[PDB]
Design a protein around this ligand. Sequence first.
Ligand code: K
Ligand code: K
Ligand code: K
Ligand code: K
Ligand code: MG
Ligand code: MG
Ligand code: MG
Ligand code: MG
Ligand code: MG
Ligand code: MG
Ligand code: MG
Ligand code: MG
Ligand code: MG
Ligand code: MG
Lengths: 52, 193, 353, 158, 98
Amino acid sequence: SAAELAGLPPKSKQESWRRKMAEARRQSLEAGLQGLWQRKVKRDQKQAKESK
Amino acid sequence: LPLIPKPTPFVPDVPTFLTLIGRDLKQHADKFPTWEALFTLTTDQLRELGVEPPRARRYLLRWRQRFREGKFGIGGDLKHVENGVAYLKIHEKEASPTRTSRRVVNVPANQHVEEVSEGERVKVKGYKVKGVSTIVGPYALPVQKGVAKLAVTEGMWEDKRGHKVDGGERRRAEVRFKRGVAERKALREKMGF
Amino acid sequence: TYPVVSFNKTSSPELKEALETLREKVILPTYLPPELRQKIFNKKYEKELAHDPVTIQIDGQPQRFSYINMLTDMPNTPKNIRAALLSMKNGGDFANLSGLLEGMHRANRKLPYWLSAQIVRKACKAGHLQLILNMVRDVKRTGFTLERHETVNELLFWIQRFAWKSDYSEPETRKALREVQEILDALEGDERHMSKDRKRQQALTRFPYHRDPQFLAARLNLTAELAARRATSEQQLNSANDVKNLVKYAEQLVRLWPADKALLDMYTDEAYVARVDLRYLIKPQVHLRYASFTLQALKNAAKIVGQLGHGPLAAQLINRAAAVEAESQLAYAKVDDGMAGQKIYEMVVGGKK
Amino acid sequence: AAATKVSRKMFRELHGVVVTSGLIDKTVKVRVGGQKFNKFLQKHFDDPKQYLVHDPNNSLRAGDVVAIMPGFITSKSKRHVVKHIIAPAGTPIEERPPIPSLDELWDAKDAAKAAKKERKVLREKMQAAEEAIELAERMARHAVREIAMREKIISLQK
Amino acid sequence: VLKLRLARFGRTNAPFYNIVVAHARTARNSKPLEVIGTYDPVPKKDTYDTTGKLHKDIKLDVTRAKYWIGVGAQPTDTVWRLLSLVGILDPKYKKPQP
RNA sequence: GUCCAAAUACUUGACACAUGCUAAUCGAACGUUUAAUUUUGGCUCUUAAUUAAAAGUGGUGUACAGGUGAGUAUAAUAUUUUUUCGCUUAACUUAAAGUGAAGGCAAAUCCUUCAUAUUGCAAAAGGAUAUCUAUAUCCGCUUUAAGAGGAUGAGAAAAGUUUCAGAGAUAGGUAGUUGUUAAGGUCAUGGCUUAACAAGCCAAUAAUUCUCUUAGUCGAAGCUGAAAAGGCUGAUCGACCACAUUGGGAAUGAAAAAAUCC
RNA sequence: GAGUGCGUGCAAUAAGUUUGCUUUUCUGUUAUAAGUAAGUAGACAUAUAGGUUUAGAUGUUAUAAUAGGAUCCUUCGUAUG
Ligand SMILES: [K+]
Ligand SMILES: [K+]
Ligand SMILES: [K+]
Ligand SMILES: [K+]
Ligand SMILES: [Mg+2]
Ligand SMILES: [Mg+2]
Ligand SMILES: [Mg+2]
Ligand SMILES: [Mg+2]
Ligand SMILES: [Mg+2]
Ligand SMILES: [Mg+2]
Ligand SMILES: [Mg+2]
Ligand SMILES: [Mg+2]
Ligand SMILES: [Mg+2]
Ligand SMILES: [Mg+2]
């Protein structure tokens, strides 16, 4: 949010929750895409290695 | 663990507590010998005393938890109640030379608003002032200009269960049809024959 | 919800002509459904309406509607309202304003902004202040809103004159004080009285109507006239309450009304420019009309408050009174002879009767 | 940037015989080989297929042996193109119009498609241009009236 | 609306759940998009542990669940409580201290 | 024929059905209606409000869940792999901007319409709670850019796959139909569309069409064999199709995907 | 002789519905006409007053053209014969 980037505090208890939920979805999406990517690379290397 | 909350001026005893939450729970007002029994009996003990059906027992255990946490219904934050009746009055402050802030406060029925001190001038939540000298809020009946009473009523805090009209959506046209038959058939017996 | 408008009490044939003209072509069509109300003004249905004219059951007797040439047959609302308003001469006649203004409100007729100030004057001078106060209270129906700084200033002028006409007796001054407060409470709380025309005039004055020093001086006048009578135990418990308000209101007026500023310098300089916004105060005739009781109020309050031992207020109120008197005297010199203002000021302030 | 060039990819090459020719312009029927496997009998059956091939210069005759390539869409039923003649029928190859290379046929599609875009940008700019003119004239008739009516009021306040 | 919820399986008096990624408006036990894990509500006990402590076995593919929470999946109240313990989301409910 | 647990339980008449229930919810969208309560004017009537109930109006959901197997005889704009793509005005996730003005119904977040929104076409809706001796918030609404999802476009190209019930009859079928030129349309491809020419294209052993009989389809889903691209079934489980007394239909909506509607 | 949840021809046909040498009507643009009804601007004057007069840039009313949507008619069309 433009307010979070500027460094402003939460306006109310509801926005504070929206900040935590939005951050939880950002942290999980980053850890999800990377975690699921290493699985693919680790799976393709094994196939390419055994098929060779 | 089973901490008991202290009674409040608006809910002083069990008969009042069971009268507010509704669901026809005031029937069992005699099962609980004291205020401490209500907040001490367990699920199994409430079942032996005869608090049934399970819907009423679970509903009671729920409101029993809300009272502990302080999640009262409407008017539960009052502080000056007498025989179950509380009077709401308006307190006016000059927020600016061209404005005025009005708050619905609860004070004794005799003392005037300006006479009461800040300590006893309680501000009830859920009630506001519309325009001037008008108190708006659930179960706020007017007594005079700038005054309204709030009396304990059956089901005042009740979570009313939903009810069907003419048997709901599926059986709406049929219940109205058959009902229309009973009407016409009645008129024939009155004026027809 | 409400009963259909009707005009069944008219003392003159001219009045009945104007009221029945608007009724049968400007008011009654408003009671028809939105569809039928379109046929009456359509040539394509002129033939049909001639045979089976649209009917609506009011009081049983159906009211027939035929084709109406929207341009050639429709009457002029401003002129008809004038012909009726000028022919009203009896209480039975003015009772029609309640229904007339209701019908215009239903027809969405944007009446002249000054029309309210005129109805208040011609009606109150005839001795029908209640008919006005009743329409104001029933604003949800009559649309008689207090959105003009002049209407409120005109209405509060008569509410005092009726009390002053009886030498400020307790039975009447008590009644007037209830009316003045009912208006200041409607201006503040009731939302029917708010409009863009009012927000503009409140921006030019910078005081909301319910706080405008010119209107608060009315409530201060009647209050100052209740304490003067006594300042029986029941009366003492009440008389002692009037003094609490007198010092309360007086101490509030001085906070709003600036120092050494009269009625023409009270508001911003841009307020007296527009002819639709507080320009009436420029004419000496209309200035003396409103600066009479206001000048008399500050003087009276300044004396009582002084007796109670309030040095500041005793000097603050005399500061305004001295400012309004200096200006009021100018108007008394520029006003033409035989004018209403010159007579009122001469009677209220001059006390010549 | 705005040029959508053809894929320009090379697919497989099939050898076949020309079955019909001269019936339609720049089109011949070519019979190629094939073999479909029957899973119940567990054997292969000859599965020859006849396609409509694109002959740009009409250089093929019936009974001719040619090499075709798929992936060259020209019509609703033509997805093959002639690559070269293996064995001619009737007359030698040099006595027939030459067969363009796939590059020449692809360059024609890019050139033909590019010209189509140039014709659109102009028809779009001109259409938008002639539209703004009409929208501009309305501003004139509405301005001369408003200006004539607004300057009049300003002239009565000097 | 994608949801991370539970699919009730097992036998009478023997509940067993599948953590699944399914559209909200579908049958509870219909074939979902993915099976993220399993959940057994009845707490178990270690074989050779006489301390009396109990535990609950829960298999969960945290990496696959984080991706769905990141794209806008809505877990039910039960799955929310589980995801909050592992440390992905914040609890929706807490024991009042006062 | 003693007990206990799990699992299964109209396979036939998609035969007819008494009775109670399976889809409702929001008063923080909206006013009506009587009830008391309290205030105005008049001298019981008559104003303006508060409160609680009962019907409604509007929003979302009844496009999910649950039931049945009557009809239905198939190769299809079906489907798998790789390459290349397109669309998406509801709901979910992240963010930005905008949330003004009238009229109709008793009123409205209903209906109608306007201003404004890179150029010029094109939007919106309000409600609620606190603070002070007007400000700030909460829940929404409109638009825009993305992620996810999708029932999405005939997507396209290359190479493949699909055991298509039983019996009988039928040799023609195709008329933008097949191709060329030109133009338009399309992300792109394709008579997809149009004009002008050519007479083609598919099929020849039944392509195409028709009659009769029977049937919901499929899966290591169930039973069975040592085994066969095994056989049989098509309950319980999952997927798909169809149906909601029978027949004939349309609209709404992001999408018919309704036990809805005509 | 009896039946027929069957196909098909012809006539007929509710809901719905294609086309256009059908018919009414609503709305949005464009160009005009009017300003008496409405509504919006400007000028002048009066005073217990708030009248007189003019004006179309935005609205309103009317006509024409044009665009689109609802009506009616036409076509197709269950039952039925
Ligand atoms: K369904
Ligand atoms: K079936
Ligand atoms: K026929
Ligand atoms: K017919
Ligand atoms: Mg061979
Ligand atoms: Mg059965
Ligand atoms: Mg089945
Ligand atoms: Mg707004
Ligand atoms: Mg290949
Ligand atoms: Mg075609
Ligand atoms: Mg069958
Ligand atoms: Mg017809
Ligand atoms: Mg006129
Ligand atoms: Mg028939």
